């Protein structure tokens, strides 16, 4: 009936001024636009249909055409920036906001979905959706005693749309919008649906990806313990954004970092640092490097949790980018740690895998590693045990690796090497 129409026929129906003809043609357009293989978004735009679809959003007496056109425009707005812009340019933003209050749940949901795609295009449309007043009516849809009474799909769409209002930078979302959304996000973060939890974590990860003040707005809401709980989830789609959020937080102050340690996050790292997903291991190791960049009592907690052997493990065998993060973790540890903590690192077997990575092609990791060796040596100096460390380094082939580094391109690389050699390996 409305299956496989030509764009020509859709236009003919939409221009008929018979509202039932328009309805059938709009549904035909929805069907074309919801096909998986190359929906003809550009042909529909070029046919001039967006203004008609937008006017149909306002037809309160014909809820079916509101739904069909909301679906058609949602799928156009799901495309390239230029496609989403065509939708915004036709006036869709206030028309979708008005539909948020529709008595028909399927129409309200579809308007939530369309605004999620518009806001998801980037900072400018995100902020334009906010200026048109989307937040108050979106939040009102979630103002129920128990989220479990909402249809599951509807709640997932609302959560996803809210996450796009939290997403993107340059600029980050307006501070007042973030403050307005946060109590609802905290509540969604405690909901029991895996997809709501994942998108709630994504939203929190965006809000903490920024300067310390943005992190504090989130940490002050008390969400860190729940994020640490979700870090432990079996679902990779939840662990991924929960870990990014935790990693973001520990880029903040020493005090923000302590909240993450206090909430028990370090106990999850034996698993994260051996996680079969490369991206999780790499993110977890980056996060460890920011914790070892912390205070001596925070380095002590990394020790107490048994995490130094795990760092030795990642240095010994991991994806190269993960080994690079491990190298930073070690350099930060040795830069901030006490001599006891540093000695401990050597006793855990850090020296050999550190030396092995000196054959890396990457120049930056060479610098980082040489920096750590220098720090370890300075610790050894204070103990009078410089010589023992020299032998350890020579025995595992490390001196050979360093001596050769005197013939490297980079200045800092050659300079740092010769300093090591002349000061410790006469």
């Amino acid at each position: 009936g409305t299956v496989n129409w030509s764009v020509e026929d859709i236009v003919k129906g939409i221009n008929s001024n018979n509202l039932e003809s328009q309805l059938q043609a709009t549904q035909a357009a929805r069907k074309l636009l919801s096909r998986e293989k190359q929906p003809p978004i550009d042909n529909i735009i070029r046919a001039g249909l967006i203004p008609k679809f937008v006017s149909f959003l306002g037809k309160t007496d014909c809820s079916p055409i509101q739904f069909e056109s909301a679906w058609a425009l949602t799928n156009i707005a799901s495309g390239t920036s230029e496609q989403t812009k065509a939708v915004v340019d036709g006036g869709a933003i206030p028309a979708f906001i008005s539909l948020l209050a529709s008595p028909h749940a399927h129409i309200s949901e579809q308007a939530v979905w369309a605004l999620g795609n518009i806001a998801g295009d980037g900072s400018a449309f995100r902020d334009l959706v906010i200026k048109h007043g989307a937040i108050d009516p979106l939040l009102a849809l979630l103002a129920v005693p128990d989220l479990s009474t909402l249809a599951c799909g509807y709640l997932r769409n609302l959560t996803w749309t809210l996450s796009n209002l939290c997403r993107n930078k340059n600029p980050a979302p307006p501070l007042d919008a973030v403050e307005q959304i946060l109590p609802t996000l905290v509540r969604l973060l405690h909901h029991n649906d895996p997809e709501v939890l994942a998108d709630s974590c994504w939203a929190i990860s965006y809000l903490t990806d920024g300067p310390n003040e943005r992190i504090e707005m989130v940490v002050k809401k008390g969400v860190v313990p729940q994020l640490v709980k979700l870090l432990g989830a079996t679902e990779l789609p939840i662990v991924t954004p929960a870990l990014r959020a935790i990693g973001n937080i520990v880029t903040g102050t020493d005090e923000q970092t302590q909240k993450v340690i206090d909430a028990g996050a370090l106990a999850v790292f034996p698993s994260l640092l051996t996680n079969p997903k490369t991206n999780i291991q790499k993110e977890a190791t980056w996060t460890m490097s920011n914790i070892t960049a912390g205070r001596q009592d925070q380095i002590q907690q990394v020790v107490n949790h048994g995490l130094v052997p795990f760092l030795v493990g990642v240095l010994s065998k991991a994806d190269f980018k993960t080994q690079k993060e491990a190298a930073w973790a070690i350099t930060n540890y040795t830069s901030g740690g006490t001599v006891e903590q540093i000695v401990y690192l050597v006793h855990c077997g850090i020296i050999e895998p550190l030396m092995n990575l000196l054959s890396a092609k990457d120049t930056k990791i060479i610098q980082v590693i040489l920096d750590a060796i220098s720090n370890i040596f300075q610790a050894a100096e204070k103990l009078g045990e410089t010589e023992k460390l020299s032998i350890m380094i020579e025995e595992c082939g490390g001196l050979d690796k360093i001596e050769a580094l005197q013939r490297h391109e980079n200045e800092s690389v050659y300079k740092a090497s010769l300093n090591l050699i002349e000061k410790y390996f006469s």
């Binding site: 069907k31 919801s34 495309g79 979905w113 997403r167």
Partner: peptide, 10 residues
């Protein structure tokens, strides 16, 4: 993570 989502045909 995709920031846009199309609603697919049922």
């Amino acid at each position: 993570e995709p920031s846009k989502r199309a609603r697919p045909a049922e």
